[PDB]
Design a protein around this ligand. Structure first.
Ligand SMILES: N#Cc1cc2c(cc1[N+](=O)[O-])=NC(=O)C(=O)N=2
Ligand SMILES: N#Cc1cc2c(cc1[N+](=O)[O-])=NC(=O)C(=O)N=2
Lengths: 258, 258
C-alpha cells in the first residue's frame, strides 16, 4: 500500500518548488524533509505520497476540548501513516505516538540584531532595556511558562506582563521585529530556525549564546505501527553514513546567502 | 522482582565512593548515572540493584564468536533488565536491544594540552607537526574511517598510517598522552568526556573546535521488555523538568576542580 506521509510547510524542510503549479505529487515539494523522506522510503522499501498537514500545525492537545491538532492529530485519528517533519520529541506527544531517534538536535536559542549587547539568557533576565519574547503559541512559550529554573522563571515573569507585549504570532513576525527594533528586541526560538535565518539576506541577524534546553526532532508513527521499527533503524543508518549532516549542510549553508 | 541494572565504571557516571569498602550494595557507588538510576526507578516504581558489567565494556559483537560482550551482551543474553550508562545509541546495538530517547547529546571533539596552537579539526588536518589520534576502537575511529568529507578523509589518511602509532587503547591513555607529549599530541574523543577532563586537575587540557558529528547516549533494555516504554517516558520527563541538565551541571561543573 502507498504510505501517507504528513508534513508541514516550514523552511527549509518542506518548500514549494518555483514552478509547482506545473508539477504533480511529490515533485511539487523540495527541502530537507523531502530529501529525508526519499531516503527513509528507500531504506524501508515503500512508496509514499507527501501531504501537507491540514491546519498547518505540529501537534498540541487542547486544555478544553482534549482534541489533538496538527500532524500528531493526523496520526492519532488515522488520517496519515507517518509524520516526516521537524516534530519535536516531547513527553506528551510520546504518550500518544511513537518517535524514532532524533534526526536533528536543537535547543531554544537567542536571536539578536547584529550589534546587540546580549550574549546569554542570563544577560536578558538582568535587564529590560532590550525587550525579548517568544512565539505567541506552542513549544517555546510553554517552556518558559512551565519552567522551574530560576533564570527562565524570571524571564517568564517579565514576558507575562511586558508593556508593550513581547509575543509574536508568526516566526516571520518575530524575525521582522528583531530586524526593525534597532537592537531593542531579542527573539527566543528553536536553534535550527535561528541558524537558518542567520543565513538569509540581508544578514543582519545573529545567533548568540548556548542553548537554553536540549531537544530533538523525530519521525513519528502511530502506536503499534508496522513502519516504526524500520524507520527508527533507517534514521540511525543515515546518521552513521553522514547523510543527515550532509543534508543539513546542503539546505542551511550550501544554499546560504551570507 | 528486583530489577538488575548493568552499568560501567566511567567517571563521572559511576564512581567508587571514598569509603566504599565500608559500604554495601548501591551505596558503594556515586555519580550521574547513579542519580539518574534513582530517578528512573522512582518514576517507573521499581526496586533495583546496581551491578558493574563484568568485562568493563560497553558492548560489541565479537569478531570470532559473534557473541555480544559488555552491557549490551548482559541485556541480550538475559543477565540484566536495564543498562543505565553512557551507552552510545548505534544502529548495530539498536538491532539487538531497545534504546530510550537520548538522555544526553554529544559529538566528537578535540582535546589539546593548553598552549597547543590548534583551534579546530581543519587546523589539525593542515599540518603534520602536532600528532593526533583517537581511541583504537568505537564510534570516533569509525566516523573517520567512513567519512567522505575532505578534511576528515585527510585526517583519517594520516592517522591510519602515522608513525609512531596515534591510536590509544583507553581514555586514560589518550588523556595521559596529551598531558605528557608537551603540546605534540591532540586527542579526538566524545565531547562529554572532553569537557569533564577540562574540569579535572591539574587543569592542563582544553576543549577546542565545534563538534565534528552528533550522537546520543540512551538507556537500554532488552527487546520486547515491559520496562522499555515507561523508561523512555521517564527520560523525556526528566529532560523537560530540567533535571538532566542539573545533573550534568552537578557532576561536571559544580564538582569541578578548575
Ligand atoms: N523550525 C521549527 C520549528 C519546529 C517546531 C516548532 C517550532 C518551530 N519553529 O518555528 O521554530 N514547534 C513545535 O512544536 C515542533 O514540534 N516543531
Ligand atoms: N564517556 C564516554 C564514553 C562513552 C562511550 C564510549 C567511550 C567513551 N569515552 O571514554 O570517551 N564508547 C562506547 O562505545 C560507548 O557506548 N560509550
Amino acid at each position: 500500500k502507498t504510505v501517507v506521509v504528513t508534513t508541514i510547510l516550514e523552511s527549509p524542510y518542506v518548500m514549494m518548488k518555483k514552478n509547482h503549479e506545473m508539477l504533480e505529487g511529490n515533485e511539487r515539494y523540495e527541502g530537507y524533509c523531502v530529501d529525508l523522506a526519499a531516503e527513509i522510503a528507500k531504506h524501508c522499501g515503500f512508496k509514499y505520497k507527501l501531504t501537507i498537514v491540514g491546519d498547518g500545525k505540529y501537534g498540541a492537545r487542547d486544555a478544553d476540548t482534549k482534541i489533538w491538532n496538527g500532524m500528531v492529530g493526523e496520526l492519532v485519528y488515522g488520517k496519515a501513516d507517518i509524520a516526516i517533519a521537524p516534530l519535536t520529541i516531547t513527553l506528551v506527544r510520546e504518550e500518544v505516538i511513537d518517535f524514532s531517534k532524533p534526526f536533528m538536535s536543537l535547543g531554544i536559542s537567542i536571536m539578536i540584531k547584529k550589534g546587540t549587547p546580549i550574549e546569554s539568557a542570563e544577560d536578558l533576565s538582568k535587564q529590560t532595556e532590550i525587550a525579548y519574547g517568544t512565539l505567541d503559541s506552542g513549544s517555546t512559550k510553554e517552556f518558559f511558562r512551565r519552567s522551574k529554573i530560576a533564570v527562565f522563571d524570571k524571564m517568564w515573569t517579565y514576558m507575562r506582563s511586558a508593556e508593550p507585549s513581547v509575543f509574536v504570532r508568526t516566526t516571520a513576525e518575530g524575525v521582522a521585529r528583531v530586524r526593525k527594533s534597532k537592537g531593542k528586541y531579542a527573539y527566543l526560538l528553536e536553534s535550527t530556525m535561528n541558524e537558518y535565518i542567520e543565513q538569509r539576506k540581508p544578514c543582519d541577524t545573529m545567533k548568540v549564546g548556548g542553548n537554553l534546553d536540549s531537544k530533538g526532532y523525530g519521525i513519528a508513527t502511530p502506536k503499534g505501527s508496522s513502519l516504526g521499527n524500520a524507520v527508527n533503524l533507517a534514521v540511525l543508518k543515515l546518521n552513521e553514513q553522514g547523510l543527515l549532516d550532509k543534508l543539513k549542510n546542503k539546505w542551511w549553508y550550501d544554499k546560504g546567502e551570507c
